[PDB]
Amino acid sequence: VQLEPNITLVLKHLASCGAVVSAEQQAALDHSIPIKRIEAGLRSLTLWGRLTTLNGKDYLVAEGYNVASSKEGAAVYETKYFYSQDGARWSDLQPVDSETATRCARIKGMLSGDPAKNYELELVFQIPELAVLRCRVDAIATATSVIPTDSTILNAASQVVPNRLFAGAAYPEKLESYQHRFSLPGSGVTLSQDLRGTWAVQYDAFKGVAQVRSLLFPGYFFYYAANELTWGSLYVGDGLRNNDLIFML
Template identity: 30%
Template sequence: MDSNSLCCSLDLVAGSGYTLSVEHRAALQTSFAILKKNYKFNRVLFWGKLLGLNGDYFIAQGNEGDEMKNKKTFYSFNCVEWHLLGPATDAMIEAVSKAARGRFMGDPSHVYECRRQGEGGGATKEEDVPVSNTMQVTEEIRLAVTVHQIDEEVSVVPRGAFIKNPQGLVQTNRSFEGLSHTEAQKLDNFFHFTEPKNLKKKSVHEMADLDPSIDFLNPLSDDIPKGCWSLQFECGSNVCVIRSLWWLGLTFFHVPVTPRHGYIYMGDGSKNVDLPFML
């Protein structure tokens, strides 16, 4: 969610039980202004909070030109001092999937270890495994991968909030005035804010209603399994709230007939892999 309207936005998702203390809100307002100036960002966004056993990670993101690409991600323990997270690579994602288990510890230097698969596949005692056959991943790498995965899978924007110009640059649509109440009731009008993958082919009649400058993303309605999103109206039916059932803790909000929208994640960084069996 945009740092310029952070306090108001947090109040709109408070129905999920996600909020910040007055001290943290005040610290974020000050530190975000400094972060934006030092890195010359167009916008600074509060991404959310990852809960750890011994400490929590506050996450922020900044972008320079393109709203979708080349985002810089930062983490902090006190909402004042921010540390840059490196981008997640395919090798990092694979390593985290094999080595990282359980809750976040709250220590970026914490090391997760797992044994590599041997050629024989036989079970051996842990103390007999050579160091060269173990895989190590720091929690800082795991943090970067988790933020990347959540962004890739469940970041949400309303249709028309962003436009793509002929040069391929994605920017905020200044003429966006929000979805109507009727439009906000349909998942078709909410998109994944990430590079589109396998855009579903539309019929001739559907193509006539599409605008290539705003319909360049995957709609939530195409997600599998059906029912992995929960759409509700709260605050006297004045706010549309969408929650992900894959990543419990991801909450998106949009105030119809206004440009106000955003999402926040507050959780332990675990994906609900049992969802297909729960629906």
């Protein structure tokens, strides 16, 4: 049914999971997402998450793509990311290299608000802070990007597009009703072919709303409403995955 996720729907349905955005930032997003979407030329652009920084200011991160193709047996999305401290001006979030990402991997703890800080690693390496931000964001994105199963379909010229006449996920309180964004619609690869305890699902049958929490990355939340076929995902928190997950289970 829906074409793009609605920010107010995400904030309304994922509020119980502690995924919230301040009032000033709410209004600023409402007025500033369309402007950047038009300036960039992207058909879709939406709030991806809110990474919390040491001092008061936080990092709001949005992502946008024009069209998603089907290449090498996977749904390839060419995405572009933007970051901001206030919800008014959206600067660009540059991509990083491979070895630089490996060096991001060894930076832990909460990152600081200032986008000019440089971290020190080891021969000494100077790591920009926006590089660490991008490394964490891309790790979270490539780990958990949920979409209900068969809500997209191929077409002529082989571009995965929204499935306009979509029945709705049957048995929505089970992981088979959801999948990764980069999984092809035809294949039966769903949210159940990953580790056995990395996801949790809560369901309300009367309201018909399902919430999916990522346990590998504790701050990733997804909702799917059955009565109105609307689904959306949000990330709140620092970009660290709990490596000590097994003891938690």
